[PDB]
Amino acid sequence: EGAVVILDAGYGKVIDRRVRELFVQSEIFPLETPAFAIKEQGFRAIIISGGPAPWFDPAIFTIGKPVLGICYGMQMMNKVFGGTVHKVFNISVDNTCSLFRGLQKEEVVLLTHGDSVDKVADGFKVVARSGNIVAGIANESKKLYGAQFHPEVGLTENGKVILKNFLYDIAGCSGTFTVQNRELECIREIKERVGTSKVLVLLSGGVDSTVCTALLNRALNQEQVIAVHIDNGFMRKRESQSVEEALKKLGIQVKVINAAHSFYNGTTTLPRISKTLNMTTSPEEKRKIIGDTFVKIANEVIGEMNLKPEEVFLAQGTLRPDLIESASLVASGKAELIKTHHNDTELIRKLREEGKVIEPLKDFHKDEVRILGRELGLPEELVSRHPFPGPGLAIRVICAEEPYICKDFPETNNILKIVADFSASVKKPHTLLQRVKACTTEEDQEKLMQITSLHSLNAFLLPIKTVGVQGDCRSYSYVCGISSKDEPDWESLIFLARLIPRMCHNVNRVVYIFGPPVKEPPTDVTPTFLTTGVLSTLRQADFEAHNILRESGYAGKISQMPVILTPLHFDRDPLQKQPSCQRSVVIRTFITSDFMTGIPATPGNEIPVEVVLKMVTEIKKIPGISRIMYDLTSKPPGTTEWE
Amino acid sequence: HYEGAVVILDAGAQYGKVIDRRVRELFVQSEIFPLETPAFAIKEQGFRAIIISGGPNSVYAEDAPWFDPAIFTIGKPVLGICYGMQMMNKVFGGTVHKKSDGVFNISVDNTCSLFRGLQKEEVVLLTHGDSVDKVADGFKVVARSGNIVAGIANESKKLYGAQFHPEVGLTENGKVILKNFLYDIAGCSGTFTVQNRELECIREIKERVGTSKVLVLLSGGVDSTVCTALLNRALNQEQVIAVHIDNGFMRKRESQSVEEALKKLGIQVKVINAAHSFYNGTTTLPRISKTLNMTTSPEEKRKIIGDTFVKIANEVIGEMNLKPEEVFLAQGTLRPDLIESASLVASGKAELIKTHHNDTELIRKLREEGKVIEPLKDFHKDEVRILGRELGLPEELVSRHPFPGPGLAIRVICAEEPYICKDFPETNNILKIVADFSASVKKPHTLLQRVKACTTEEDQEKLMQITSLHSLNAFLLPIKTVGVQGDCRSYSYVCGISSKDEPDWESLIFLARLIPRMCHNVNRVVYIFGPPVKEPPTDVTPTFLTTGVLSTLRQADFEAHNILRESGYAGKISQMPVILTPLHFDRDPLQKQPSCQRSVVIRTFITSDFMTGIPATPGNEIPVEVVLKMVTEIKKIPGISRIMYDLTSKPPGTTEWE
């Protein structure tokens, strides 16, 4: 009703995105959708696409609605009207055709391989040509248009113009499907669902949660929205306070629960009884404890608020909510805590089973949430923040009592010494060099020759466990460190960072260590747990790196940047027998679309060397810091986080 | 040592590998080197030409990586792409505009050597960075996009720059451009073919191996087979010892047709019939495991199979009295590693010999002594097949889809008990509402409100249409299957869907994506062929890795694959697991008939890399009628209740069901 239906035979998502970017509402339907169903719903126009015969209602062409056939859609269109078939380019277009007004006679388009029109359907006219291949057809009086190319991609340079001609000129869509209007529709639906009931929101301090809170407050009375922040003791420096301050500025008050002590001393049942969080080393155990503790506290706090419990809603900032979550997913990463089953969480269980859990942001994409936040009056600084994980800094401290050394340790280090000193090592061949040779490509070997002669590198295992993905599985295994005598050549390090995990599948990460060469890598660890002093050190480190990044103008160039503390104290004379007391900081830059794959930022490339070095300079000053390191690993085998 | 060869200096990490691929497709040898490689090294190595690339970044950046400007002056032809052109212009005293990336139609100077054979107008991928103001002296502008300089040339020193990427397909005639540079300009002859690479590879095998024997463990897969043929072609008949251990989990007569094809080419294969050894195989738990033919757990299946294989392999080397000190082991692996991950062994494809096993001393020694070689390491997947043909292997043999080490063992869902957790009834109620959405919406209750609250407006709309046009049932099946959610593997429910009417495939595929988004306790969604399933089973047919169960699946797998092959669409799918499930449908619940029949799943899969992928949609990548023939045919096999079609993509699914 003012909208446009997309029927795909395979592109639907892409057309959906382009139509949305042009401020028209776009629902995708299955190809078999009948025309009466489309007429009943009041769609203004129909878009039909598909790759290089499935059941469709030919009435989609006959019911008097404008139709755009892209590719297969164009073929269907032609076939339905009698036409036949036989058997990136600069094509010719007839800019008098409604679809093509305001284009040049010549257009760059993405043409896909497959069938091509022979007899052009009666009442239709050819309106685009690529050599002889018919690239466009049109019946103006029936407002049916076929294009062989895909205007919905960016590789078709003026595809946005074509789509505009279809939606506005031909179909008469007015361009009112904006974030502003969707926000107002969203407010109306919130008013309608909630009525006079109170709404509790569990505000974590992240972007989605804050916009959700601001949206709920905008939709409802001031007295109807209760924002509750449970501080788990693992949040960054000053960023709890500034979220409260921003929401306060908008007339929204936030109830803060200072629950740090209950998280630090958190303990739970394991799939047996866990250690307290402040004595745990296991990342899986950290997540369960924190997950289980948060929910117990949330459930209690809801209890304490003396609300009529059949007039309470619980609202979340989740963009992709689920009915049932898996505990497997809770154990390993991001997950909806309130959607999994727990003990001592009756109130939450009741809200869930009563249909009182709402996700107002479910109809918005991630970029839209930001625009939504600006519109609701939140500062741009706040809405542009990088994601920050629920368990916060807890998964950013590598905790250990003992060094991580398995029986493969000595061999792997021998392999690594060869890799780092490859050009020299080739001049004194031994058994293990031959194994390296037998497992690496001629091209890789040759590139290794150059790299290791142009620079003096050391490579070695660090006695710590980090998470990584090997095939379908998460795995905990070694970090490999590289240091150099002179300034680092970044691209060469990136290369080693890919090469080493390929050679040694027991290596999950390759990092670069800043400063002088590491002649004697530690074989011991600084004892490290989630204690208030350790968290204090990391908070200051994380703060400095993030401020430096932000002040530099480059914060938007990276998706995320975990800053990690490791139990490693470097540069002790081994014949001095001095104990391991200091810790070391990793900078883990990450660039990604979807967080399934991604790359570090290469300094000199997406981020300036100077910015990175300034981080190193500043963090070194923090008391208790041995070395700074830079994570060079891609995902896979890396992951964004270190645990 | 590199005459006839070209060197690629990549300032970044992106374009080096693409240029390398393109150059190799042009039959020229290509080496990727660091940007900072000195001119004299390039000179002494013998390279015929240099290609330099990198991205939009400024060469005037305080960051700009170091390079040896004498690379431009050693007298070898140079093609600079984007960053490379920017470097080139800077070196020879040009400048960039003070002020400040799609696909444009640009103009090109026909007479410049780089552009011979092209029309003046050309479509290219133009990058977005710095643009040439003062063109370096001795250079002429040879390509233009509006006012922007897009190409430069110095013909006398054979130096060419382009502001676009001819190495990408989206530069329509980028191949012609690279051809002009490698052939017309640099004078490469195009000797770097699979044929000549094979001859070089043979020379290298003779050299490393001498008169020593080479053992190869022939798995039956393409890589293993090509490797075996390769080694035979390089050495004597007496030198190559090919051993095929039959693990009992192979497909119908494909460890015969691989022995036969190799014998016909003069290659003898010692076959070890070890099926029974695997069936009753056992291993330590990561305590003794159960026997393979009594195991339900896929981790145990893999470890048992993996451990047994290496133990027998070691046993065979022993009985031949082959000393590791005078013998080699060869693997068909494309991407070998020195050290294998112990996790990967237990969960999927891995090099079994590059991990420590107990009681495998001869294999350990072969690895430790550097006697494991990988002939195929310098070839890509597409080249392996070409190589196999050139070695005289049959097209049907080099063309086979991958088939996992543990074979059919991970394609039988083994069970004694139904898989049922506390979430079972709740999940079934959710699925009932999903399947019956438009009718459920007409009579709304609390659970419906939970469904609307977790679904997008769009998905609800799409779901309204679907569930009014067809009458569908949806329900959990009481079995476990592997799935990947985010970073992690999971073992959880399969959801089933049946319909009164003919299946609408795109609707089912939508449902297949929706249901796992709503219910993260669900790893897969299948379509069950035939009449509606009114009363889903809550019991399972007890099922283990036993000879009769294997006989049945082997037959189902055979039929499915034959139909696929004889219809011509075999090459359109990447892999087709056929899976046996412990499920007996259509028993009248008010009668207490025991579960004794089983059901077959067709799992079509399409992928580039096996990290993500999709099922084939019947009527899309594969004809409906071909799928329906598998259904008709497989149903005839004794003991088979229903046929199912896997609708799940990866993620949340995986290729295999275990």
Ligand SMILES: O=c1[nH]c(=O)c2[nH+]cn([C@@H]3O[C@H](COP(=O)(O)O)[C@@H](O)[C@H]3O)c2[nH]1
């Ligand atoms: O809320 C969260 N709870 C968690 O336990 C968790 N673990 C990882 N992450 C975030 O998810 C994204 C992917 O992280 P990985 O690449 O390490 O899997 C990145 O954005 C990570 O920060 C989490 N978020």
Ligand SMILES: O=c1[nH]c(=O)c2[nH+]cn([C@@H]3O[C@H](COP(=O)(O)O)[C@@H](O)[C@H]3O)c2[nH]1
């Ligand atoms: O040699 C193997 N041993 C195994 O244990 C194994 N498990 C999966 N596969 C194959 O690997 C690819 C990925 O499948 P998944 O999506 O199930 O991980 C698919 O091609 C699978 O056939 C295996 N191969």
